[PDB]
Amino acid sequence: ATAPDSQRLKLLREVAGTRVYDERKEESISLMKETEGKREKINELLKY
């Protein structure tokens, strides 16, 4: 009860079952951005 609201928001959000989706999406964003850089490199080499 004397917990700050954010803790209960996290608790109910977990109760909804929406944690794994969140974690995997944020993890995937970094890797995809790195692929974006790679694609830039690819286009450079193609022009050469």
Binding site: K38, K41, I42, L45, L46, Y48
Partner: peptide, 21 residues
């Protein structure tokens, strides 16, 4: 990644030449 690797390999390939002088 595989495509990038293949492109880099290709670019290393094409740089050969044979000028017998």
């Amino acid at each position: 990644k595989y495509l990038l690797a293949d492109c880099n390999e290709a670019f290393i390939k094409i740089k050969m030449a044979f000028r017998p002088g």
